[PDB]
Amino acid sequence: ALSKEILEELQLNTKFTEEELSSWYQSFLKECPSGRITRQEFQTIYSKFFPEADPKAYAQHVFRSFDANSDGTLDFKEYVIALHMTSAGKTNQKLEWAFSLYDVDGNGTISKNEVLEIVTAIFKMISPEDTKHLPEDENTPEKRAEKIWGFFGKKDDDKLTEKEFIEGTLANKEILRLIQFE
Protein backbone atom coordinates (compact mmCIF):
# COMPACT_ATOMS: atom_id res chain seq x y z
CA ALA A 1 0.00 0.00 0.00
CA LEU A 2 1.09 3.59 -0.54
CA SER A 3 0.55 5.21 2.87
CA LYS A 4 2.46 2.26 4.29
CA GLU A 5 5.54 3.22 2.31
CA ILE A 6 5.08 6.88 3.04
CA LEU A 7 4.39 6.12 6.64
CA GLU A 8 7.78 4.53 6.52
CA GLU A 9 8.99 7.94 5.55
CA LEU A 10 7.80 8.69 9.09
CA GLN A 11 8.11 12.16 10.69
CA LEU A 12 9.61 13.38 7.41
CA ASN A 13 5.93 13.65 6.58
CA THR A 14 3.91 11.65 9.10
CA LYS A 15 1.02 14.03 8.53
CA PHE A 16 -2.43 13.38 9.98
CA THR A 17 -3.75 9.86 10.25
CA GLU A 18 -1.28 8.43 7.77
CA GLU A 19 -4.25 6.33 6.69
CA GLU A 20 -5.60 9.52 5.16
CA LEU A 21 -2.75 9.38 2.67
CA SER A 22 -4.15 6.07 1.47
CA SER A 23 -7.63 7.36 0.77
CA TRP A 24 -5.98 10.35 -0.86
CA TYR A 25 -3.94 8.19 -3.18
CA GLN A 26 -7.01 6.30 -4.33
CA SER A 27 -8.68 9.63 -4.97
CA PHE A 28 -5.73 11.31 -6.64
CA LEU A 29 -5.14 8.05 -8.48
CA LYS A 30 -8.57 7.73 -9.91
CA GLU A 31 -8.59 11.46 -10.57
CA CYS A 32 -5.51 10.91 -12.71
CA PRO A 33 -4.47 7.39 -13.67
CA SER A 34 -1.36 9.06 -15.06
CA GLY A 35 0.62 7.64 -12.14
CA ARG A 36 3.59 9.88 -12.98
CA ILE A 37 2.77 13.55 -12.46
CA THR A 38 4.95 15.64 -14.75
CA ARG A 39 5.97 19.22 -14.03
CA GLN A 40 3.75 20.38 -16.85
CA GLU A 41 0.60 18.96 -15.32
CA PHE A 42 1.48 20.15 -11.85
CA GLN A 43 1.95 23.58 -13.35
CA THR A 44 -1.63 23.11 -14.53
CA ILE A 45 -2.80 22.85 -10.95
CA TYR A 46 -1.24 26.14 -9.96
CA SER A 47 -2.37 27.65 -13.23
CA LYS A 48 -5.97 26.58 -12.61
CA PHE A 49 -6.43 27.91 -9.05
CA PHE A 50 -4.09 30.62 -7.60
CA PRO A 51 -6.41 33.42 -8.63
CA GLU A 52 -4.53 35.91 -6.49
CA ALA A 53 -1.50 35.78 -8.75
CA ASP A 54 0.40 33.61 -11.21
CA PRO A 55 2.85 31.53 -9.19
CA LYS A 56 3.58 29.72 -12.44
CA ALA A 57 7.35 29.86 -12.04
CA TYR A 58 6.89 29.02 -8.37
CA ALA A 59 4.80 25.95 -9.13
CA GLN A 60 7.52 24.65 -11.38
CA HIS A 61 10.12 25.48 -8.75
CA VAL A 62 8.43 23.40 -6.06
CA PHE A 63 8.13 20.53 -8.50
CA ARG A 64 11.88 20.55 -8.92
CA SER A 65 12.20 20.69 -5.15
CA PHE A 66 10.86 17.12 -4.61
CA ASP A 67 10.95 15.79 -8.17
CA ALA A 68 14.63 15.83 -8.73
CA ASN A 69 14.58 14.15 -5.38
CA SER A 70 16.46 11.30 -7.03
CA ASP A 71 13.68 9.59 -8.94
CA GLY A 72 12.42 11.08 -12.22
CA THR A 73 8.74 12.06 -11.84
CA LEU A 74 6.45 13.33 -9.13
CA ASP A 75 4.52 10.33 -7.84
CA PHE A 76 1.57 10.79 -5.52
CA LYS A 77 3.86 9.91 -2.64
CA GLU A 78 6.05 12.88 -3.45
CA TYR A 79 2.84 14.89 -3.79
CA VAL A 80 1.88 14.35 -0.16
CA ILE A 81 5.35 15.34 0.99
CA ALA A 82 4.91 18.61 -0.93
CA LEU A 83 1.48 19.31 0.48
CA HIS A 84 3.07 18.69 3.86
CA MET A 85 5.81 21.31 3.60
CA THR A 86 3.52 23.79 1.87
CA SER A 87 2.05 24.44 5.30
CA ALA A 88 2.24 21.99 8.18
CA GLY A 89 5.64 21.69 9.84
CA LYS A 90 6.15 23.97 12.84
CA THR A 91 8.10 21.96 15.41
CA ASN A 92 9.61 19.07 13.50
CA GLN A 93 12.71 19.23 11.31
CA LYS A 94 12.20 20.45 7.76
CA LEU A 95 14.77 23.18 7.16
CA GLU A 96 16.94 20.60 5.43
CA TRP A 97 14.22 20.47 2.79
CA ALA A 98 14.16 24.24 2.63
CA PHE A 99 17.78 24.18 1.56
CA SER A 100 16.57 22.45 -1.60
CA LEU A 101 13.54 24.41 -2.72
CA TYR A 102 15.67 27.50 -2.22
CA ASP A 103 18.09 25.81 -4.59
CA VAL A 104 17.19 24.63 -8.09
CA ASP A 105 20.71 24.22 -9.51
CA GLY A 106 21.36 21.16 -7.43
CA ASN A 107 23.01 21.39 -4.08
CA GLY A 108 26.20 22.48 -2.47
CA THR A 109 25.66 26.06 -1.44
CA ILE A 110 23.06 28.77 -1.99
CA SER A 111 24.39 31.42 -4.37
CA LYS A 112 22.82 34.77 -5.13
CA ASN A 113 21.85 33.34 -8.50
CA GLU A 114 19.97 30.46 -6.89
CA VAL A 115 17.83 32.62 -4.65
CA LEU A 116 17.45 35.14 -7.41
CA GLU A 117 15.48 32.51 -9.31
CA ILE A 118 13.17 31.71 -6.43
CA VAL A 119 12.91 35.41 -5.71
CA THR A 120 11.95 36.27 -9.26
CA ALA A 121 9.44 33.46 -9.39
CA ILE A 122 7.98 34.59 -6.10
CA PHE A 123 7.67 38.14 -7.40
CA LYS A 124 5.22 36.84 -9.97
CA MET A 125 3.21 35.23 -7.19
CA ILE A 126 2.98 38.76 -5.77
CA SER A 127 0.22 40.50 -7.70
CA PRO A 128 0.51 44.21 -8.44
CA GLU A 129 -1.98 45.07 -5.72
CA ASP A 130 0.49 44.20 -2.98
CA THR A 131 3.60 44.97 -5.01
CA LYS A 132 2.34 48.52 -5.44
CA HIS A 133 2.30 48.77 -1.65
CA LEU A 134 6.06 48.27 -1.40
CA PRO A 135 8.36 50.76 0.37
CA GLU A 136 11.29 52.45 -1.37
CA ASP A 137 14.62 50.92 -2.34
CA GLU A 138 12.84 47.58 -2.48
CA ASN A 139 10.54 46.90 -5.42
CA THR A 140 12.44 44.42 -7.60
CA PRO A 141 13.78 40.87 -7.35
CA GLU A 142 17.22 42.41 -7.66
CA LYS A 143 16.65 44.82 -4.81
CA ARG A 144 15.09 42.23 -2.55
CA ALA A 145 17.63 39.61 -3.51
CA GLU A 146 20.09 41.89 -1.78
CA LYS A 147 17.94 41.89 1.34
CA ILE A 148 18.05 38.13 1.75
CA TRP A 149 21.63 37.71 0.65
CA GLY A 150 22.58 40.56 2.96
CA PHE A 151 20.50 39.09 5.77
CA PHE A 152 23.00 36.25 5.93
CA GLY A 153 26.21 38.23 5.41
CA LYS A 154 27.90 36.55 2.45
CA LYS A 155 29.78 38.70 -0.05
CA ASP A 156 30.49 37.55 -3.60
CA ASP A 157 33.06 34.92 -2.70
CA ASP A 158 30.71 33.54 -0.08
CA LYS A 159 28.31 30.76 -0.94
CA LEU A 160 25.81 30.10 1.83
CA THR A 161 26.29 26.50 2.88
CA GLU A 162 23.67 24.05 4.13
CA LYS A 163 24.94 24.40 7.71
CA GLU A 164 25.13 28.15 8.16
CA PHE A 165 21.86 28.33 6.26
CA ILE A 166 20.34 26.79 9.32
CA GLU A 167 22.42 28.84 11.68
CA GLY A 168 21.71 32.11 9.92
CA THR A 169 18.14 31.39 10.94
CA LEU A 170 19.01 30.06 14.39
CA ALA A 171 20.34 33.43 15.52
CA ASN A 172 18.26 36.12 13.83
CA LYS A 173 14.85 34.55 14.38
CA GLU A 174 13.55 37.42 12.23
CA ILE A 175 14.19 35.61 8.96
CA LEU A 176 11.58 32.83 9.11
CA ARG A 177 9.04 35.42 7.97
CA LEU A 178 10.94 36.63 4.91
CA ILE A 179 12.54 33.34 3.91
CA GLN A 180 9.03 31.90 3.90
CA PHE A 181 8.11 31.55 0.23
CA GLU A 182 4.84 33.19 1.24
Binding site: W24, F28, Y46, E182
Partner: peptide
Protein backbone atom coordinates in the same frame (compact mmCIF):
# COMPACT_ATOMS: atom_id res chain seq x y z
CA UNK B 1 -7.95 28.33 9.68
CA UNK B 2 -4.61 29.92 8.84
CA UNK B 3 -2.42 29.55 5.76
CA UNK B 4 -4.13 26.19 5.28
CA UNK B 5 -5.68 27.32 2.01
CA UNK B 6 -2.38 26.67 0.26
CA UNK B 7 -2.20 22.98 0.97
CA UNK B 8 -5.90 22.81 0.24
CA UNK B 9 -5.38 24.32 -3.23
CA UNK B 10 -2.78 21.84 -4.46
CA UNK B 11 -4.73 18.82 -3.17
CA UNK B 12 -8.28 19.99 -3.82
CA UNK B 13 -7.14 20.90 -7.31
CA UNK B 14 -5.57 17.65 -8.46
CA UNK B 15 -8.69 16.19 -6.91
CA UNK B 16 -11.51 17.92 -8.77
Amino acid sequence: MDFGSLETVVANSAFI
